[PDB]
Design a protein around this ligand. Structure first.
Ligand SMILES: Nc1nc2c(ncn2[C@@H]2O[C@H](COP(=O)(O)OP(=O)(O)O)[C@@H](O)[C@H]2O)c(=O)[nH]1
Ligand SMILES: [Ca+2]
Length: 308
């Protein structure tokens, strides 16, 4: 009697659906993708197997014209279709760009529906670039607050952080792929945790304990080899330049270390200590270990931090 958790990733609005499209291209297994949009033109280009056009009577098939009230009403008008799409989910990631009309207004409705169905509900959203102006930022902030009230856990990516990782020539689409990686690697990290029985095993119940009704979250993965690999991988897992919520102040952590047969007890301690020292709190750790004999010198550290 084993459990196989059903994970769904739901893009809401333009940015959320483009993140979904790029995740589908990258390849993702045992995850169902759902695309939700008012904009029928964009929805027709989605690569997701489940598409939900919301608000057609309201927008005549256009987007929401930057009006979050239209996104919200569109989603409410389509509650039954959204429910049907979520059915069966054990975990739902709702991804959306805040500041426009559809994501800002509809993404919190989608998240609330998922949570009401008992699914562990994680939001992964962007805040707009400052160059998009104060009004867009203020609308986005109201969306972020509505998301907080509707999810178990929330990861916010301020788009301005992308300006910290580009040079003057980095293509915009390349920068967007870096933001996509936050979602994709968090999903993959949970998927991998569920699929393998670890030598010290963590499972979906541990994910639920760390993430259910917690507020802000960090989800990261680090990979390193050679000398100091465990410390370096742990540092990478907790240190993304793109996150509003850093590791500092976390009081709950799920941490998994995967390595080959050379994985040492000492380096597992070193990695665990990096995470708790950076948190600078009494951290309640759920610690796991997977020995993958295919691996030679690589170590992979996965962190989920909550409790801020
Ligand atoms: N990082 C990232 N941000 C995006 C992307 N598309 C849109 N955005 C951001 O998301 C916000 C809302 O845009 P959009 O999702 O198209 O609006 P909506 O469809 O009305 O929800 C914009 O103001 C941008 O800050 C994307 O592909 N990547
Ligand atoms: Ca497992």
């Amino acid at each position: 009697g084993s459990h196989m958790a059903t994970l769904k990733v739901i893009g809401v609005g333009g940015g959320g659906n483009n993140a979904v499209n790029r995740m589908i291209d990258h390849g993702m297994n045992n995850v169902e993708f759902i695309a939700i949009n008012t904009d029928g033109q964009a929805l027709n280009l989605s690569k997701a197997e489940s598409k939900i056009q919301i608000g057609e009577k309201l927008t005549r098939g256009l987007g929401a014209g930057a009006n979050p009230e239209i996104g919200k009403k569109a989603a409410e008008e389509s509650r039954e279709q959204i429910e049907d799409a979520i059915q069966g989910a054990d975990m739902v990631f709702v991804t959306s760009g805040m500041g426009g009309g559809t994501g800002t207004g509809a993404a919190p409705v989608v998240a609330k529906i998922a949570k009401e169905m008992g699914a562990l509900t994680v939001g992964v959203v962007t805040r707009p670039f400052s160059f998009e102006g104060r009004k867009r930022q203020t609308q986005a902030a109201a969306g972020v607050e509505a998301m907080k009230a509707a999810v178990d856990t929330l990861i916010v990516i301020p788009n301005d952080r992308l300006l910290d990782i580009v040079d003057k020539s980095t293509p915009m689409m390349e920068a967007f792929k870096e933001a996509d990686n936050v979602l994709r690697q968090g999903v993959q990290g949970i998927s991998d945790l569920i699929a393998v029985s670890g030598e010290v095993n963590l499972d979906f119940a541990d994910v639920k304990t760390i993430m259910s009704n917690q507020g802000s979250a960090l989800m990261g993965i680090g990979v390193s080899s050679g000398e100091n690999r465990a410390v370096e991988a742990a540092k990478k897992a907790i240190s993304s330049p793109l996150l509003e919520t850093s590791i500092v102040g976390a009081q709950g952590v799920l941490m998994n270390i995967t390595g080959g047969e050379s994985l040492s007890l000492f380096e597992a301690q070193e990695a665990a200590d990096i995470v708790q020292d950076a948190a600078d709190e009494d951290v309640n750790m759920i610690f796991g270990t997977v020995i993958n004999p295919e691996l030679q010198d690589e170590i992979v550290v996965t962190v989920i931090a909550t409790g801020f």
